[PDB]
Amino acid sequence: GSGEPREEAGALGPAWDESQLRSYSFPTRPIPRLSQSDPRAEELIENEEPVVLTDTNLVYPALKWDLEYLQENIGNGDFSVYSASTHKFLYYDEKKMANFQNFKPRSNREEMKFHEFVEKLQDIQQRGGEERLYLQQTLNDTVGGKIVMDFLGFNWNWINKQQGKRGWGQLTSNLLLIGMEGNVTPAHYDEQQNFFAQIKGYKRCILFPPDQFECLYPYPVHHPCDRQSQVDFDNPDYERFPNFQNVVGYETVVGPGDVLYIPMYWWHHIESLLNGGITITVNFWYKGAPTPKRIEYPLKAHQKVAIMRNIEKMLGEALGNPQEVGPLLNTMIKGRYN
């Protein structure tokens, strides 16, 4: 699925090896790895299909980053450091905890200074694989001059050529990520174009097209975990999510100089290879190209997902209580569209 490991330059041996990939209950096809000059790449990006561009130098200067360097050249600054009790990082939207008062969060986020992060990070590495941390921070923290330089060294010309050539809109977000081995962010989906610039370490990426909605079972729109598959990929419950047995995604392993496009609405599942050491990556999120007023039929999968999403929110308003959403949809269907 992820293909045979790539060989490191200067006979340094296979980049990674199969034992470092976690086990899953489904097939996968490889995402094509190409050059930014290859016409087929611009194509795939235009038909909103994932690609792995290998020579964009988007993050060239950052390829030298590492803990030591980073702590040494970054200002005090606050760094959101997410922590989990296992490999699965269970992120959640606080603003929606009211709607599901019995939802107990399993991913604390603590603000701390970079060095403090490195500390706890090493601690775990000496006592043991207890928690797993994940520092996610934006690239606007006036950080060490050294860093700002590197941030400037990024290939903006290129990435911008995209933002315009593709017709997308504003760059919604830009985060820096440093994780440990085995870190996994369960499958989920954004409604924005994605570019993941791998830097240090290798990351396994698994994507499912929006049309795989019926097999992934997102949480209810009003649920803290909205946009995330409810299926434990480590132990699917085919009794509740039977169509998970029909899921099929594209996968690939990204290394230091690679940039993976993740078309909006797609489902991505990210995991830092086991025994692969720490991983550093910077991600970019561009708001999508404004939708055409002329809607052609039939609709693309994401257009439906849009529809579904809205109707749910719509009933949230109407009924004045997101809990009643379910019961309504059911009476509306049972015996009628069953």
Add this chain to the structure above:
Amino acid sequence: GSGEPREEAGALGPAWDESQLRSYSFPTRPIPRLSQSDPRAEELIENEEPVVLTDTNLVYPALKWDLEYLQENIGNGDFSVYSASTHKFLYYDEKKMANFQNFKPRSNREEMKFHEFVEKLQDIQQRGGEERLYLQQTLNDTVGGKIVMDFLGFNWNWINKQQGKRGWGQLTSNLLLIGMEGNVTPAHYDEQQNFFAQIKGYKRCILFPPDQFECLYPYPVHHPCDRQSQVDFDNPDYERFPNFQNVVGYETVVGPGDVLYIPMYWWHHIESLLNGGITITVNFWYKGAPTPKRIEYPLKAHQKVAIMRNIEKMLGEALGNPQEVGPLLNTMIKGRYN
């Protein structure tokens, strides 16, 4: 359920008798029979609960109408005469036959002159209970002067006191109905206030509150039979409509001088008593009182029905094909709000 027959004045014997009522698989409570001067009646009408007003004289002059009289005093005029092959009259909205191309209609409507109606009507009565006819025509056909007089004799003062005192809007429709024994119009619902002025013969009326939606299973909004229960009351299919076993309605038998209020959205099922001869009745349909901009929660059942109705139509637009409605609702629910 419908109570013991009322005794006819002047020792003419019980009005009707139990053997004339069809058999059904569910319990029923009686609708209260009151006087228009009774405060409780205005109450029930205000809380949109059905009542049977017995002394409104709404249709006093018409109580003399009968075939002979009617044919004799009504202009040529065209009279929609619906015909069925059995007791169940299967009405349908033509404008929605495109959406269900495999829908085969079982209720022809033929335009004809009153006398022609009486003819065919008697024919059936001599050869036999083959078809069952049902003449439904508006009260604006410039008909025989004799009739116009009677139409004027109606108690407009009263009925208007309602249209205003209740806050309702325009009188949407006003039809005249003449049916034969055993005629049944399967349960269904209007979104308008109803007043049924019985004239000749006796009619059995069965109503279910809007909150009985989950037990009645209306057809899909885009279906020719939209607004009608899909359940054959003569042979329910508890396998597909299990909640029909929880249905419970109010019932009553209307005779010559009675007027039954049928609050908007409610479900009514009408049948002309077996061996009761022909039935004549004039019905009034008033558009409801404009909805308050201030919506109190939780919502009344009909408010939900409104919601559901809309969402269906909404998906009809969006997906550009009422057929896809079902499949969408299901993927949206399966594994999510199941």
